[PDB]
Paper text:
The fused rings of QPS2 and Ex54 occupy the same region as the adenine of AMP but extend further into the pocket, displacing the waters that hydrogen-bond to N6 of AMP. The quin(az)oline projects deeper into the pocket than the adenine ring, making additional interactions with Phe321, Pro323, Asp326 and Tyr371. These are displaced in the QPS2-bound and Ex54-bound structures, and a hydrogen bond between the 7-methoxy group and Trp322 is introduced (3.0–3.2 Å). The methoxy moiety also appears in close contact with the carbonyl of Trp322 (2.4–2.8 Å), which may offset the affinity gains from the introduced hydrogen bond. The sulfamide groups of QPS2/Ex54 do not project towards the zinc site (as per the phosphate of AMP), but instead form hydrogen bonds to Glu373, Asp376 and Ser377.
Ectonucleotide pyrophosphatase/phosphodiesterase 1 (ENPP1) is an emerging therapeutic target in human cancers owing to its role in degrading cyclic GMP-AMP (cGAMP), an agonist of the stimulator of interferon genes (STING). Ectonucleotide pyrophosphatase/phosphodiesterase 1 (ENPP1), also known as PC-1, is found as a secreted protein in the extracellular matrix and as a membrane-bound protein intracellularly and on the cell surface. Apart from viral poxins, ENPP1 is the only known hydrolase of cyclic GMP-AMP (cGAMP), which is a second messenger generated by cyclic GMP-AMP synthase (cGAS) as an innate immune-system response to double-stranded DNA in the cytosol.
Author numbering: 105 to 921
Write the structure that this text describes.
Amino acid sequence: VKSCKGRCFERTFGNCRCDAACVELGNCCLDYQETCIEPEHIWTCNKFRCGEKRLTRSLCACSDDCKDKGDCCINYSSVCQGEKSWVEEPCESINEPQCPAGFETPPTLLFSLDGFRAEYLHTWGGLLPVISKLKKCGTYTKNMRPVYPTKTFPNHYSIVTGLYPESHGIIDNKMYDPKMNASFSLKSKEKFNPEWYKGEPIWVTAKYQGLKSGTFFWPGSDVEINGIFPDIYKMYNGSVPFEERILAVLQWLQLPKDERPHFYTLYLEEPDSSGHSYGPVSSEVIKALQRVDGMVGMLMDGLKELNLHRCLNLILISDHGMEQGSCKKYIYLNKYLGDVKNIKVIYGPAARLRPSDVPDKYYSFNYEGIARNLSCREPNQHFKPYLKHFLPKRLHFAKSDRIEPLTFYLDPQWQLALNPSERKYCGSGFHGSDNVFSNMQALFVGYGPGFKHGIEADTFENIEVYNLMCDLLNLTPAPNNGTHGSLNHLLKNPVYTPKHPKEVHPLVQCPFTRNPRDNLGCSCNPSILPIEDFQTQFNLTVAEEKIIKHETLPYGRPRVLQKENTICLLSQHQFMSGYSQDILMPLWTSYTVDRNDSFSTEDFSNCLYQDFRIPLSPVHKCSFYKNNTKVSYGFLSPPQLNKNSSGIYSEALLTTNIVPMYQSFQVIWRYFHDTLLRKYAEERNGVNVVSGPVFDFDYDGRCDSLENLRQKRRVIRNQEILIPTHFFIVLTSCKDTSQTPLHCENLDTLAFILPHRTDNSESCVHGKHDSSWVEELLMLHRARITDVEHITGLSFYQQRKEPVSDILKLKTHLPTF
Ligand SMILES: *[C@@H]1O[C@H](CO)[C@@H](O[C@@H]2O[C@H](CO)[C@@H](O[C@@H]3O[C@H](CO)[C@@H](O)[C@H](O[C@@H]4O[C@H](CO)[C@@H](O)[C@H](O)[C@@H]4O)[C@@H]3O)[C@H](O)[C@H]2NC(C)=O)[C@H](O)[C@H]1NC(C)=O
Ligand SMILES: *[C@@H]1O[C@H](CO)[C@@H](O[C@@H]2O[C@H](CO)[C@@H](O[C@H]3O[C@H](CO)[C@@H](O)[C@H](O)[C@@H]3O)[C@H](O)[C@H]2NC(C)=O)[C@H](O)[C@H]1NC(C)=O
Ligand SMILES: *[C@@H]1O[C@H](CO)[C@@H](O[C@@H]2O[C@H](CO)[C@@H](O)[C@H](O)[C@H]2NC(C)=O)[C@H](O)[C@H]1NC(C)=O
Ligand SMILES: COc1ccc2c(Oc3ccc(NS(N)(=O)=O)cc3)ccnc2c1
Ligand SMILES: *[C@@H]1O[C@H](CO)[C@@H](O)[C@H](O)[C@H]1NC(C)=O
Ligand SMILES: *[C@@H]1O[C@H](CO)[C@@H](O)[C@H](O)[C@H]1NC(C)=O
Ligand SMILES: [Zn+2]
Ligand SMILES: [Zn+2]
């Protein structure tokens, strides 16, 4: 008499009412809403609904017959039969997958929570029980590094292609292509134009190898790519409630095996939506995090009902993080340029500049002009104009013609526009900043038979996930920017065992040739002890060679993977090197600074000794460089480093150990070898060094072919000289500072690809100590060893006893401080 249970919408006499008219009269039963109305709007059972008379308008049922008719709400068993929800069960390991026929290869589901920054789980884990249990029972990283720019379409498409945006063509949510003379927008018909989307998304990879795919939203999944759609896909519609998306995927997993997909996707707009609207630290973001946690729980409860919770490989992921924007942390360019109307500026933290008159002036326009106009205009300026090829190589943001030739690099929390009118609310949450900023780091949790249990992996990049998903589905990956095997440590049973790459040609021989001691035009410091008998000093016993090889190449010599190359090994007492006769320059030197080594202050300028192992060339003579305004030279292995004396190491002054070097770059190079290298050596109990030139004239992150290098030589004093685009450095010590670089159990690495520029305008030098700015520039231009490998065509560490996959893990690491 006091409850609507069983009598929804039936007229009553005397009892509280359960008809629509009761509301206005205020004589409804206490439970009228929960019993009769709520079921039309919710996907959950509760203590009011358990044993309900079936309602015709209810989204799912909590009636006694719901199991038989198979339309129970997902939480029915937990709430109405007192069984445990997935999250309530303790972790148990999934060694053998428990799958139906059709799933001999188990399915993989890629579940994106847009704008879920890694920090949300660090801080709010206690409010997020389901995601917290997936972490506890699964494979987790505190930080997954997204691609630059840290935006939705770029990162989602990178996750399913393993490609940098510069290569997959989706470089932002808004772009212009000058060859197509079209603009890309998420609100335009151009979003569906196949021409934008390059590479091979995993659902295409899967199709070619006999697996069907089912996407409930993913950037690109509603587009015909290489003539292919997913076998099941949805036209984007953000209004579709999360519950309906999850329920649909659970229907696809019940398809008969002939039509049932193996690869699934799920995309939710939260907590990105709430992040923008209310900021990453807000009541709205907390409620949004609890909601997506509940939705993940709904999937797991759903998989459990289907007995697929020990079958399906789930990758819970996000595209990027979220930062608090501020109207006080917004740069407007009109302050420096005036209210000009000939330029269009892409606003945000990944701001870019382009002429209005396109495609006509797209290449011809004076980018360099505005670049110089906007450099070092204030002290502690919060932005930096960069021609795209001068951006740090770690950002891999230049190759595409869709990347405007002038870009801006913004400090954390800072954004940029032309003027206040051409942006949105400045106080909103935002993302797009440098992919190494803490608040831009993303979520990754892997749970299922394929994944290890209770593992916390070191930080990895989302471009590695394509290969991982391919391994989980026994697919052969399309060519991508991931290092295949670098994530084998996440997998119970790795399917791909990587091998170190084999070098194409063997080392050529550079033998001693008797030739006349020639004048090089050098005014050598009298301090330096010249090389009196070369043939004597460099005819080494195999006993003596083995001592040097062990001290300078403790990890093995760099191997050269280039097609056409003639490299030869040069021994010296303190360093080894690979010399290119084809470019008259070493491709790499290797030496080791010990904790108790000496660095000389004695001048060694305009001093060189002839190396009788290679033909003498005009560009190897002090005379070529004497009062030369266009280029100078520098040494790879540092002459300042003496082990046997307290003077200058004479063997380092050989013509074979010099590289063309702009006078402005010498400031950086000197500071590194005089100050920093000594400090590193002390702090780490020694440091092995490998340094060399880099030639990336195509600014594509790859070493240029020898064919291409011929046409890139400059003419200076009627000599053909090849000037490096960058210089690389790779420092290697031990994790354990009790050990020296020659006897490490575990390698601690730190690599740089320093840009080789005619000025130091990048660093805004004037009125600041030399000390500060050089370390700041090194930090900004750090790189993975894998980045160095791709851009030099070298391969390091091939003599380490570690398995290959462990070395790939080490080479793909990027140091964060
Ligand atoms: C990330 O991974 C990417 C995929 O592996 C990789 O990009 C590939 O780069 C190579 C070389 O730049 C591209 O391969 C072709 O190589 C020749 C060079 O001789 C190009 O000329 C050729 O272009 C073409 O032009 C022809 C016109 O006559 C035509 O017949 C061809 O069909 C073709 O259009 C190729 O471009 C390859 O396409 C790239 N793939 C993609 C998807 O971008 C990146 O280098 C790698 N990034 C890093 C930093 O490692
Ligand atoms: C995008 O997804 C939206 C949410 O799924 C969807 O909106 C919803 O569309 C349904 C259509 O059934 C509306 O229901 C209306 O139509 C039925 C059919 O007879 C009648 O009961 C009523 O006239 C009812 O108003 C929902 O009201 C509506 N839901 C919401 C929250 O707006 C869109 O249709 C989807 N598609 C596109 C392309 O926009
Ligand atoms: C490149 O695209 C631009 C912009 O769409 C084109 O410019 C337009 O030209 C038409 C022809 O009279 C006019 O509608 C307008 O002057 C422009 N339209 C807009 C929307 O700005 C241009 O024709 C295209 N082609 C080339 C190669 O320049
Ligand atoms: C079906 O393929 C897709 C998947 C996602 C798409 C998308 O995802 C987004 C949604 C909303 C915001 N804006 S937000 N999260 O602030 O409200 C951004 C990206 C935008 C446009 N098309 C898509 C097609
Ligand atoms: C920068 O260019 C603007 C025009 O866009 C000009 O008015 C201004 O004087 C320039 N500022 C310099 C050169 O510092
Ligand atoms: C030329 O080089 C010498 C030292 O070799 C240097 O002291 C001098 O400044 C330079 N001369 C000119 C013309 O700049
Ligand atoms: Zn996003
Ligand atoms: Zn966003």
